[PDB]
């Protein structure tokens with residue numbers, strides 16, 4: 055529908071992967087209807103985080119929240135040239151909810167500093 | 175689903191508030207289905223105005239349309255340090271449709287000035 | 295629902311045109327339900343291309359892919375001051391899928407050059 | 415001297431085990447409502463996941479439990495507009511037939527187009543669909559449930575169903591040949607839909623299916639546990655050859671205004687016995703193949719016997735052939751401890767199919783002669799506890815496990831945060 | 840219904856009637 059080409063490099067390192075109409079309530083129609091609703095729900099579910107973090111229309115957006123070393127103690131050579139995006143998630147999956155809240159407020163405080171900056 | 179935390183400061187001043195699967199057409203299933211469709215409809219209903227005004231991914235975006243004093247004659251101390259976002263809407267709810275059209279075209283004329291600027 | 299005002303200048307030149315609730319599965323209810331789903335599907339269908347090309351919230355976004363003259367050999371006076379957006383599509387409709395892939399990767403390579411630039 | 419900051423990445427190769435709704439796709443009508451499925455992509459794209467090993471489990475899949483409910487819904491949805499046989503639950507007066515397969519010639523009073531008038535019509539009923547009252551007989555279903563006879567225009571022709579995953583989800587296909595069905599798989603690729611899976615309902619023998627690329631592969635959960643069903647998958651298909659020889663005729667009654675019960679007319683020609691032929695020295699050649707693989711898990715002599723006993727659907731090779739539902743006796747197939755072999759089959763008209771709580775279908779008599787040819791690609795045995803295996807099969811959902819063992823549904827989590835030396839200026 | 844009273848407020852009746860059965864031609 056979109057693409058599973060992102061998934062091509064699921065075993066590659068993090069540095070390599072990153073670099074008709076009419077509705078009929080038949081058993082297949084109800085099946086194919088929820089698939090259409092379940093797609094736009096899961097799509098906007100991710101797309102509203104990108105918007106609220108100030109990253110809509112971006113694939114790679116840099117933030118302003120420093121990397122708290124308690125989230126991971128590994129080196130940049132141990133991450134981007136060793137771990138895969140699939141296993142790196144399992145190591146950091148505890149702090150993902152703790153990180154998503156910091157990127158959410160780093161964008162919020164950046165917005166009020168701009169409304170004071172452009173007022174000159 | 176998202177958050178009603180925005181609503182925490184509904185009585186605060188404008189300067190304080192701003193600062194499983196499977197579908198079954200049972201009576202609850204049809205009820206819970208429209209709630210899912212009514213969410214993505216009302217969400218994009220607001221999100222397309224933000225996009226067409228050149229403010230997607232933004233919480234506070236400054237525009238280029240000057241404040242016509244006929245919309246409100248109050249002072250900046252009478253607004254941000256007195257009125258709440260709930261009552262300020264009732265005072266300006268007449269010109270909201272008249273303002274939403276100016277922000278819509280201020281973005282449109284900004285786009286053609288950029289296509290002439292980046293051509294150098 | 296949105297606007298067919300874009301369509302006002304369907305015969306104009308390219309330079310002129312550019313410049314209640316409750317769900318009931320009655321025959322009309324199922325009809326009006328898919329219209330609601332078919333709208334948000336076709337809307338995001340276009341809106342995800344704008345996002346993946348780095349053009350979300352934009353009406354006119356300049357890119358970095360040069361114009362391969364094999365797509366069209368006409369002059370800028372033959373295009374913007376002669377052809378209409380309706381007939382220009384028929385002339386270029388062969389390479390539209392070939393162009394949409396270049397704008398997709400021009401944005402992708404721009405993202406990795408920014409993550410190296412802002413690292414200084 | 416690092417200065418690392420959180421960086422958001424959209425579109426990272428990471429997924430999550432999840433269950434969702436799978437919609438159907440088909441190629442260029444029957445009970446499976448394939449006219450309602452979207453057209454399949456003529457070039458089914460497949461993306462290979464190099465360096466990826468994923469853990470599958472064909473026995474704790476949800477594609478099975480979901481397809482099983484879809485076929486039952488496809489079955490019941492197709493019988494909604496068909497004629498109810500409530501008035502056919504009258505007192506039958508039956509006699510025998512001619513000077514195994516017993517057939518009766520039963521006369522009964524029946525309604526007509528007008529409520530006040532009746533008709534004395536007669537029909538043929540197979541002995542298996544009818545019990546004696548104590549010669550006054552009775553339809554075997556009237557005491558537990560009503561019966562809806564099939565609309566004679568629909569067909570039970572099993573045609574390939576493509577199960578697809580929604581946008582934002584994915585399906586992981588294990589491509590390792592000798593894949594046990596459970597555990598890690600070293601050759602994993604992702605697909606949007608599965609292959610063409612035919613909903614072929616059968617017992618003991620799996621007809622018309624996917625073969626093993628080499629060496630007869632055997633699948634189960636706890637092999638040491640005998641209560642867990644074993645599923646064999648043959649490498650070379652032995653061909654079964656079935657036919658109902660009797661030249662039947664269709665006699666259409668009219669049990670009401672628009673309601674036409676199709677009764678079994680006369681038997682033109684000889685009266686023979688419905689049966690199936692499979693090749694000896696080929697079932698024997700492919701049974702020593704299943705044999706040497708059963709001993710790789712059980713050290714020991716292995717024995718083959720017949721079914722345990724009980725219902726007819728449980729203890730027979732029940733399947734479909736040209737429209738009528740055969741019930742073949744496979745005691746002559748599983749009878750060897752490690753030219754043809756003919757299986758006497760009976761034919762029923764009152765079938766319950768999904769073993770549901772009181773719902774049957776009257777299979778109308780197909781006029782003419784019936785004959786079908788089916789590959790035997792799979793098997794399902796049942797150990798006791800001299801390691802004997804009787805042809806059982808357990809449940810019906812194991813049919814769909816034999817074809818879904820390669821697939822697994824996962825959801826995409828394209829969001830990932832990782833430290834970089836860039837800072838938003 | 841063919842009803843009689845009950846025993847030698849809340850009145851209860853004991854009613855006998857003809858009723859259909861599993862077979863259309865027979866009654867009970």
Ligand SMILES: *[C@@H]1O[C@H](CO)[C@@H](O[C@@H]2O[C@H](CO)[C@@H](O[C@@H]3O[C@H](CO)[C@@H](O)[C@H](O)[C@H]3NC(C)=O)[C@H](O)[C@H]2NC(C)=O)[C@H](O)[C@H]1NC(C)=O
Pocket residue numbers: 655691753754
């Ligand atoms: C055992 O069962 C068989 C059912 O499969 C009976 O029918 C015979 O099957 C043979 C196998 O298909 C047929 O021969 C085939 O003929 C076609 C036509 O030319 C060829 O393509 C095949 O290669 C060929 N196969 C072989 C192995 O030769 C026979 O034609 C068919 N019989 C008849 C009368 O047509 C067998 O009769 C049955 N045997 C016994 C002893 O019961």
Ligand SMILES: *[C@@H]1O[C@H](CO)[C@@H](O[C@@H]2O[C@H](CO)[C@@H](O[C@@H]3O[C@H](CO)[C@@H](O)[C@H](O)[C@@H]3O)[C@H](O)[C@H]2NC(C)=O)[C@H](O)[C@H]1NC(C)=O
Pocket residue numbers: 653655787
């Ligand atoms: C399953 O079994 C049936 C019957 O046992 C097989 O059908 C047989 O197919 C052969 C194929 O050649 C037929 O032979 C030909 O018959 C025609 C017409 O009579 C004749 O003109 C030819 O010279 C030749 O003899 C044979 O008649 C036919 N038999 C019947 C009863 O239909 C069928 O092929 C088997 N399917 C398999 C093994 O897959």
Ligand SMILES: *[C@@H]1O[C@H](CO)[C@@H](O[C@@H]2O[C@H](CO)[C@@H](O[C@@H]3O[C@H](CO)[C@@H](O)[C@H](O)[C@@H]3O)[C@H](O)[C@H]2NC(C)=O)[C@H](O)[C@H]1NC(C)=O
Pocket residue numbers: 572614616621622733734735736737786787788789
């Ligand atoms: C296993 O697969 C084979 C082939 O895919 C199945 O044989 C097929 O059987 C059907 C009938 O059940 C045949 O189709 C129909 O025949 C009738 C009768 O003439 C006709 O009216 C229809 O128009 C249609 O032709 C079909 O020809 C036949 N296929 C072959 C190759 O002979 C078999 O039934 C399957 N087994 C099971 C258990 O599903």
Ligand SMILES: *[C@@H]1O[C@H](CO)[C@@H](O[C@@H]2O[C@H](CO)[C@@H](O)[C@H](O)[C@H]2NC(C)=O)[C@H](O)[C@H]1NC(C)=O
Pocket residue numbers: 545557558
């Ligand atoms: C409907 O009829 C069947 C067939 O007679 C019943 O199953 C029988 O139950 C009686 C119990 O008295 C046994 O004696 C028979 O041996 C059973 N027959 C078979 C084939 O198992 C079934 O119980 C009846 N259903 C109901 C609800 O009474």
Ligand SMILES: *[C@@H]1O[C@H](CO)[C@@H](O[C@@H]2O[C@H](CO)[C@@H](O)[C@H](O)[C@H]2NC(C)=O)[C@H](O)[C@H]1NC(C)=O
Pocket residue numbers: 622623651789
């Ligand atoms: C029954 O099995 C035979 C043999 O595997 C199948 O015939 C094969 O079909 C494939 C697909 O077209 C071909 O690539 C092979 O060359 C065929 N083999 C032979 C020996 O002809 C047949 O399609 C199967 N039929 C069913 C209904 O499953």
Ligand SMILES: *[C@@H]1O[C@H](CO)[C@@H](O[C@@H]2O[C@H](CO)[C@@H](O)[C@H](O)[C@H]2NC(C)=O)[C@H](O)[C@H]1NC(C)=O
Pocket residue numbers: 661663682782783
């Ligand atoms: C089964 O019996 C029927 C008769 O009940 C046969 O039907 C006849 O078939 C011949 C074919 O040459 C036709 O010319 C006749 O008109 C048919 N009769 C009727 C009444 O339709 C049928 O042929 C038999 N089936 C087989 C396989 O022989």
Ligand SMILES: *[C@@H]1O[C@H](CO)[C@@H](O[C@@H]2O[C@H](CO)[C@@H](O)[C@H](O)[C@H]2NC(C)=O)[C@H](O)[C@H]1NC(C)=O
Pocket residue numbers: 519520521536538679680681
């Ligand atoms: C089943 O029995 C009935 C008897 O009720 C048979 O109908 C008779 O058929 C003969 C032969 O054509 C006629 O002469 C009689 O007049 C028929 N009687 C009635 C009452 O219709 C019927 O043929 C039998 N069915 C079969 C398949 O043999």
Ligand SMILES: *[C@@H]1O[C@H](CO)[C@@H](O[C@@H]2O[C@H](CO)[C@@H](O)[C@H](O)[C@H]2NC(C)=O)[C@H](O)[C@H]1NC(C)=O
Pocket residue numbers: 729743744745746
């Ligand atoms: C299936 O067929 C076999 C024979 O092919 C039947 O076997 C007989 O079963 C009876 C009942 O137990 C025994 O007394 C006989 O000795 C068996 N004869 C043999 C093995 O040659 C069997 O009954 C059939 N089963 C069904 C359900 O029809």
Ligand SMILES: *[C@@H]1O[C@H](CO)[C@@H](O)[C@H](O)[C@H]1NC(C)=O
Pocket residue numbers: 505507521522523534
């Ligand atoms: C039909 O009903 C009559 C009584 O109304 C009965 O005498 C006759 O035997 C019945 N015929 C049948 C059941 O075939």
Ligand SMILES: *[C@@H]1O[C@H](CO)[C@@H](O)[C@H](O)[C@H]1NC(C)=O
Pocket residue numbers: 594595596597598633634635636637
């Ligand atoms: C199937 O094979 C796998 C090999 O990875 C093994 O771990 C598992 O125990 C086997 N299970 C059975 C039932 O044979």
Ligand SMILES: *[C@@H]1O[C@H](CO)[C@@H](O)[C@H](O)[C@H]1NC(C)=O
Pocket residue numbers: 589600601
């Ligand atoms: C995976 O399967 C493909 C299928 O052709 C094969 O070419 C490849 O060698 C296999 N790789 C492994 C590691 O088994």
Ligand SMILES: *[C@@H]1O[C@H](CO)[C@@H](O)[C@H](O)[C@H]1NC(C)=O
Pocket residue numbers: 745746747749
């Ligand atoms: C089982 O095999 C034995 C020995 O070959 C044979 O005597 C017997 O008839 C067979 N039973 C069946 C049902 O084929």
Ligand SMILES: *[C@@H]1O[C@H](CO)[C@@H](O)[C@H](O)[C@H]1NC(C)=O
Pocket residue numbers: 841855856857
């Ligand atoms: C049942 O019907 C018969 C007539 O068919 C009648 O004589 C009898 O009284 C009825 N019994 C009841 C209503 O209990």
